[PDB]
Amino acid sequence: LGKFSQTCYNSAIQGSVLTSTCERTNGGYNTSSIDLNSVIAAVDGSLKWQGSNFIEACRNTQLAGSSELAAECKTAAGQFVSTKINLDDHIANIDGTLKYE
Amino acid sequence: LGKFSQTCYNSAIQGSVLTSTCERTNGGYNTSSIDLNSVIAAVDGSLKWQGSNFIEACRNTQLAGSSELAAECKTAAGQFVSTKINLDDHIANIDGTLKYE
């Protein structure tokens, strides 16, 4: 599942939104964006799938490398930790558009 | 929070996917989509935030007005009931991309 980074380039993250330019199935490419806040949660400071609204607990989001979302997130106790998640786990390039799967 | 309908137009709902054309922060427009199935649940026939996968229990999804999602969802007892939820509560436009917050 996922693996968008293998067929996309010029990816960027601003806030909770990922943008990238991806290869289409029958040739050519397309630029699209997807909000990651709908599909990533913060759980005691760690980014996890199967949830939403990590941005309520996190700040300074960045794209590290070709597919990692990095951020500083608030733990249950209230202090922050550095955390990351590999977007290639579930963000795919479906015919030129970024999708969660 | 939310209020995407104030800066977007030509919105449409297909299944659980909302598509709309939104103005970017400094001008210009972008058409994007967000899969509402990631952020809306259906509990005993009623659509609600703070959950996911409402489409598993619902049919006949439609956009009502500029910002409401309407559908028919299955109650625990078995029968379907009409239900609606206002997407403007938690779907926003950030620089041309639909986002959950």
From Swiss-Prot, chains A, B:
* Annotated consequence of substituting residue 30 to A/Q/V: Prevents N-glycosylation upon overexpression in yeast without changing anti-HIV activity
What species was this sequence derived from?
A: Nostoc ellipsosporum
Tell me the SMART domains matching this sequence.
CVNH
Instruction: Kindly list the cysteine pairs connected by disulfide bridges.
Output: 8-22, 58-73
A GO molecular function term, named singly, is: carbohydrate binding
BP GO terms, sorted? regulation of defense response to virus
Q: Which family does it belong to?
A: Belongs to the cyanovirin-N family.
Q: How is it used?
A: Overexpression of this protein to provide quantities adequate for medical use as a topical microbiocide has been attempted in a number of systems including E.coli, Lactobacillus jensenii, the yeast Pichia pastoris and Nicotiana tabacum; see PubMed:20162270 for a review.
Post-translational modification, briefly?
Answer: Cleavage, or reduction and alkylation of the disulfide bonds results in the loss of anti-HIV activity.
Its quaternary organisation is: In solution exists as a metastable domain-swapped homodimer which very slowly converts into a more stable monomeric form at room temperature. Under physiological conditions it is unlikely that the dimeric species exists and indeed the monomer is more active against HIV. Interacts with HIV-1 gp120.
- The protein's name is Cyanovirin-N
- Which Pfam families does the annotation name? CVNH
Look up the further comments and give them: Its activity in situ is unknown, however it acts as a viral entry inhibitor, inhibiting HIV-1, HIV-2 and simian immunodeficiency virus (and some other viruses such as feline immunodeficiency virus, measles virus and human herpesvirus) infection and replication. It prevents essential interactions between the envelope glycoprotein and target cell receptors by binding to carbohydrates on viral protein gp120 and possibly by other mechanisms as well. Addition to cells must occur before or shortly after virus addition. Is remarkably stabile; the protein can withstand multiple freeze-thaw cycles, dissolution in organic solvents, treatment with salt, detergent, H(2)O(2) and boiling without significant loss of anti-HIV activity.
Q: What does this protein do?
A: Mannose-binding lectin.
Keyword annotations for this protein, in alphabetical order, are:
Antiviral protein, Disulfide bond, Lectin
